Amino acid sequence: PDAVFGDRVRRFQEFLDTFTSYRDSVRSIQVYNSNNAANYNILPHRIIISLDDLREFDRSFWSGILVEPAYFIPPAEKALTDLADSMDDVPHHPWKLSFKGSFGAHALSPRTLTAQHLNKLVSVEGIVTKTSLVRPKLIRSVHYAAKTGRFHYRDYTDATTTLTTRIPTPAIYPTEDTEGNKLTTEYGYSTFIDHQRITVQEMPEMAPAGQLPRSIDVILDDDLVDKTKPGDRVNVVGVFKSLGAGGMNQSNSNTLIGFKTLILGNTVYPLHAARQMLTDFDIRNINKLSKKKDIFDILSQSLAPSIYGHDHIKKAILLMLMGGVEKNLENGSHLRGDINILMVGDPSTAKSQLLRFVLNTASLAIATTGRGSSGVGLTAAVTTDRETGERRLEAGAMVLADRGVVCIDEFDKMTDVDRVAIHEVMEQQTVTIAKAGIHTTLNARCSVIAAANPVFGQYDVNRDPHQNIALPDSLLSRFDLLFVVTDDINEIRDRSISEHVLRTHRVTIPFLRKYVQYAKERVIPQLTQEAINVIVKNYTDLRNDDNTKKSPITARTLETLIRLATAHAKVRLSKTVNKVDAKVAANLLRFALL
């Protein structure tokens, strides 16, 4: 080699200053991993090269990485790995790259493919909805002649080295090397690696309205597997790559593409438009405003900046969204610790308004639109044969609902077959199915939010308040709060409405999402004899007043009456169940029932 190797070596003296700040980093990450492994009685080989250390002072070496990314990366690895041993060889796995930074206009939205940069560096974002299997793969197996005691060596190359199209080895395992010895193979010293494909859709808001979402796929490696839950705003970066013989491997080859698009990439990141690290400053201010004894009320009014009133509804949403705990019974069935509120109202009274903006601040809680095909909580045994001999129970809609919220619409405008499914997932946290395959109890922590409409217009007052939708009481008994939104007409009421819609055709949100997601990590009190003494008195008088009046209540309603106040103390961020929480819990039900 002298021409193709010279600017390697000139870079081999160049980039060693481009890890003046990382040559500490790459050895500090292993010296304790070498230490703890010797005193057990763990991290991969990630070497994040920024742009900044390779753009401030190298230009010929720079643009080679963004024009021809095929003669440069295995140079960068081979010159990396000697520094692993030249730093660390006394105690007795190739350290590939990641390359974070910016890029300067390669945010190819994959609705667009490129004519300029094929076989180059690409930055891609979107959502994944495939999540295929996991399967290991060999790279190097070592053979051993059991007679004469001598060893052997063999490496298999594939379409996995990411860059060099070597002569493949169309072989699985050889036998009988040039001797009369029956070949033995040591599998502890044979190395493996995994292999997982995933398809990425289009972020369906920035693709303009002329098409359905498109998709491509990406092969990643072990370092960031099981990181990709289906429904994450992911952002990957890798090389663009074609493989496969198009036009010769079969004869006459008419109308068959033979150039599959692939991405053999690295370093995914979740984004947000779970990881939000805050400093000492904002963590102290949120304690400083915690000292105020009004902030439960301020958060109610600072949520929906368009609509008047409904402060009973507005406190309920933030009470539900933050969530109440479920303490599992030891060697016993745990109870309902989910909360599940419901609404109904005569039309155009903002029943669906506030239902869509809970999805923006959802904190990884992606909901459906309530279109009630069978698949709302199940699998329907969709396997697609998974490359000839693998059957997979593909996750329909509960792998996204776990420790999150959902919302569905149009209950009475549904068939029967969804209603039997919402029976099971409410009485029990899990679904278990055996369609043409395997019985499997997979767990789910869900919390529905409902929206239906009454049937006969404005007939609520002149008839019974109950049966007003007459969907089965299997769900009404499994639900707690049936807010009936009024629309009464008062000349000061509507006049106040008329300007407030008009004033908006022309205490903050990201602080709000931090406060709740910090409050999911604080301890749960549950324990004060004072607060439990007053609520049962508060129950008994309405236990005299439920049956001689509107609506009979049951024992599970008491498990609400702990749970609302339990979450209400989670707003307080304290470990003492106070007295003041028990007054808002009683008063909220009093409007919900009267």
Partner 1 sequence: MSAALPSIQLPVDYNNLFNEITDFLVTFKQDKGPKYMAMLQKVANRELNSVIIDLDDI
Partner 2 sequence: LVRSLSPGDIVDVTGIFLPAPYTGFKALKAGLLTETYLEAQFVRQHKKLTSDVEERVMELITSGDVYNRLAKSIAPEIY
For the bound state, the minimum distance from the C-beta of residue 581 to partner 1, rounded and expressed in Å, comes to 56
Element (H, E) at 584: helix 581-593
Q: 567-582: string of b/e by CB count within 10 Å (b at 16+)?
A: bbbbbbeeeebbeebb
The 377-416 site mask, x for binding partner 2 (CB under 8 A), equals ----------xxx---------------------------
Stretch that binds partner 1, among 151-159, 230-238, 518-526, 564-572 (CB under 8 A): 151-159
By a kind-dependent CB cut-off of 5 to 8 A, residue 156 interacts, out of ligand ATP, partner 1, partner 2, none, with partner 2
Collect contacts of 394-397 with beta carbons under 8 A, ≥24 apart: 395/131, 395/230, 397/368
Within residues 165-184, the interface with partner 2 by CB under 8 A covers 170, 172-173
Q: Does 460 bind ligand ATP (CB under 6 A)?
A: no
By a kind-dependent CB cut-off of 5 to 8 A, residue 349 interacts, out of partner 1, partner 2, ligand ATP, none, with ligand ATP
Q: Does 136 bind partner 2 (CB under 8 A)?
A: yes
Question: How many whole angstroms separate alpha carbon 542 and alpha carbon 38?
Answer: 65
By a kind-dependent CB cut-off of 5 to 8 A, residue 195 interacts, out of partner 2, partner 1, ligand ATP, none, with partner 2
Which residues lie closer than 8 Å to 262 by C-beta, 6 or more apart?
217, 218, 219, 241, 242, 243
Which residues lie closer than 8 Å to 386 by C-beta, 6 or more apart?
132, 133, 392
Q: Does 259 bind partner 2 (CB under 8 A)?
A: no
By a kind-dependent CB cut-off of 5 to 8 A, residue 141 interacts, out of partner 1, partner 2, ligand ATP, none, with none
Q: Does 138 bind partner 2 (CB under 8 A)?
A: yes
Question: How many whole angstroms separate alpha carbon 197 and alpha carbon 238?
Answer: 14
Burial classification of residue 481, based on how many CB atoms lie within 10 Å of its CB (0-12 exposed, 13-18 middle, 19 or more buried): buried
Question: Helix, strand, or coil here: 231?
Answer: coil
The 499-528 site mask, x for binding ligand ATP (CB under 6 A), equals --x---------------------------
40 DSSP 8-state letter: -
Reading the block at residue 207, the tokens are 């693709």
Q: Does 192 bind partner 2 (CB under 8 A)?
A: yes
Residue list, annotated binding site for ATP: 345-352
Question: Quick one: which of 46, 55, 111, 152 contacts partner 1 (CB under 8 A)?
Answer: 152
Which residues lie closer than 8 Å to 436 by C-beta, 6 or more apart?
381
By a kind-dependent CB cut-off of 5 to 8 A, residue 130 interacts, out of ligand ATP, partner 2, partner 1, none, with none
For the bound state, the minimum distance from the C-beta of residue 407 to ligand ATP, rounded and expressed in Å, comes to 12
CB of 126 or CB of 345, closer to ligand ATP = 345
For the bound state, the minimum distance from the C-beta of residue 470 to partner 2, rounded and expressed in Å, comes to 32
DSSP for 364-386, please give it.
S---------TTSS--TT--GGG
> Nearest CA to 134 among 199, 190, 193?
193
Stretch that binds partner 2, among 134-142, 272-280, 376-384, 585-593 (CB under 8 A): 134-142
Q: Does 436 bind partner 2 (CB under 8 A)?
A: no
Question: Quick one: which of 143, 351, 563, 572 contacts ligand ATP (CB under 6 A)?
Answer: 351
For the bound state, the minimum distance from the C-beta of residue 181 to partner 1, rounded and expressed in Å, comes to 13
For the bound state, the minimum distance from the C-beta of residue 570 to partner 1, rounded and expressed in Å, comes to 49
Question: How many whole angstroms separate alpha carbon 106 and alpha carbon 284?
Answer: 40
For the bound state, the minimum distance from the C-beta of residue 312 to ligand ATP, rounded and expressed in Å, comes to 14
CB of 32 or CB of 189, closer to partner 1 = 189
By a kind-dependent CB cut-off of 5 to 8 A, residue 187 interacts, out of ligand ATP, partner 2, partner 1, none, with partner 2
Residue list, annotated binding site: 345-352
Collect contacts of 411-418 with beta carbons under 8 A, ≥24 apart: 411/450, 411/451, 411/452, 411/469, 411/471, 412/452, 412/453, 412/455, 412/469, 412/471, 414/372, 415/372, 417/372, 417/374, 418/372, 418/374, 418/376
What sign does the CA torsion over 454, 456, 462, 466 have?
Answer: negative
CB of 307 or CB of 414, closer to ligand ATP = 307
By a kind-dependent CB cut-off of 5 to 8 A, residue 94 interacts, out of partner 2, partner 1, ligand ATP, none, with none
Q: Does 333 bind partner 2 (CB under 8 A)?
A: no
For the bound state, the minimum distance from the C-beta of residue 308 to ligand ATP, rounded and expressed in Å, comes to 6
Question: How many whole angstroms separate alpha carbon 284 and alpha carbon 280?
Answer: 6
> How many residues contact ligand ATP, by CB under 6 A?
13
Whether 119 and 240 have beta carbons less than 8 Å apart is answered as: yes
Question: Quick one: which of 27, 154, 392, 513 contacts partner 1 (CB under 8 A)?
Answer: 154
For the bound state, the minimum distance from the C-beta of residue 153 to partner 1, rounded and expressed in Å, comes to 4
> Nearest CA to 515 among 338, 283, 241, 314?
283
Q: Which amino acid is at 134?
A: V
> How many residues contact partner 1, by CB under 8 A?
11
Within residues 109-148, the interface with partner 1 by CB under 8 A covers 142
Q: 358-392: string of b/e by CB count within 10 Å (b at 16+)?
A: beeebbbbbbbebebeebbbbbeeeeeeeeeeeeb
Question: Quick one: which of 12, 61, 72, 156 contacts partner 2 (CB under 8 A)?
Answer: 156
For the bound state, the minimum distance from the C-beta of residue 454 to ligand ATP, rounded and expressed in Å, comes to 10
Enumerate the β-bridge partners of residue 234.
126, 270
By a kind-dependent CB cut-off of 5 to 8 A, residue 155 interacts, out of partner 2, ligand ATP, partner 1, none, with partner 1
Q: Does 150 bind partner 1 (CB under 8 A)?
A: yes
- Interior angle at CA 277, CA 273 and CA 282, nearest 5: 100
Report the residue count for the chain. Answer: 594
Reading the block at residue 289, the tokens are 């405003």
The 289-328 site mask, x for binding ligand ATP (CB under 6 A), equals -----------------xxx--------------------
Question: How many whole angstroms separate alpha carbon 130 and alpha carbon 395?
Answer: 10
Alpha helices for 307-395 (secondary structure H): 311-322, 353-356
By a kind-dependent CB cut-off of 5 to 8 A, residue 178 interacts, out of partner 1, ligand ATP, partner 2, none, with partner 1
CA 201, distance to chain mean position in Å, is 15
Chain breaks in the chain following residues, C–N > 2.5 Å? 41, 92, 273, 506
- Binding residues for partner 2 (CB under 8 A): 135-138, 156, 158-159, 170, 172-173, 187, 192, 195, 387-389
- Binding residues for ligand ATP (CB under 6 A): 306-308, 347-353, 453, 497, 501
- Binding residues for partner 1 (CB under 8 A): 142, 149-155, 177-178, 189
